[PDB]
Amino acid sequence: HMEAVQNRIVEAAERVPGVRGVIHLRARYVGQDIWADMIIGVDPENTVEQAEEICEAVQAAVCGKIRRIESLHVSAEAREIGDTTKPSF
Amino acid sequence: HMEAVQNRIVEAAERVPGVRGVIHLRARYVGQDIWADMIIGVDPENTVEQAEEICEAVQAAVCGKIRRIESLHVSAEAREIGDTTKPSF
Numbered sequence: 001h002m003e004a005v006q007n008r009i010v011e012a013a014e015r016v017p018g019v020r021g022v023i024h025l026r027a028r029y030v031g032q033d034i035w036a037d038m039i040i041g042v043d044p045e046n047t048v049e050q051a052e053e054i055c056e057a058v059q060a061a062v063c064g065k066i067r068r069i070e071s072l073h074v075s076a077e078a079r080e081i082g083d084t085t086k087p088s089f
Numbered sequence: 090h091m092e093a094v095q096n097r098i099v100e101a102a103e104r105v106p107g108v109r110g111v112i113h114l115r116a117r118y119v120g121q122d123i124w125a126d127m128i129i130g131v132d133p134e135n136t137v138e139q140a141e142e143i144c145e146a147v148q149a150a151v152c153g154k155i156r157r158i159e160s161l162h163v164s165a166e167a168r169e170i171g172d173t174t175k176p177s178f
């Protein structure tokens with residue numbers, strides 16, 4: 001159920017290089033399949049293009065490890081090292 | 090109601106420099122107040138820090154013109170000029 005699944009999504013995303021934590025995550029079942037949207041933190045100095053490449057890696061990683069996800073939208077926001085101005089999981 | 094409001098949110102955001110269209114927008118009433126989350130397109134060559142500054146400008150612009158919004162979360166994804174690989178409003 002959703003709490004365990006969300007934990008596994010977060011652990012998988014945080015293993016991808018360039019990820020500075022997960023800031024936002026929403027997920028729901030549609031039938032037996034999971035639809036999720038997440039926002040990861042990344043280095044503010046990355047270009048937006050580089051951040052997209054990180055989000056694509058997260059998408060492959062998370063989808064690759066969690067069978068039951070049918071759709072996973074990943075995008076990014078700026079996160080400086082150690083900053084406490086944004087939420088995290 | 091939500092369709093007119095969403096139109097006005099989109100028009101306001103698209104007047105802010107650095108915005109390459111609105112890609113995603115979700116909004117709901119909580120009581121008489123509006124809570125919204127949006128994703129704007131920006132130049133892939135922007136840094137993530139520059140994209141955040143654009144999102145902050147959108148937030149001031151939209152909130153400044155639409156009284157009834159209590160919370161508006163804005164973040165960004167890469168959008169190349171004329172590209173058709175992402176949705177838009």
Ligand SMILES: [Zn+2]
Nearest residue numbers: 073112113166
């Ligand atoms: Zn998107």
Ligand SMILES: [Zn+2]
Nearest residue numbers: 023024077162
């Ligand atoms: Zn955020």
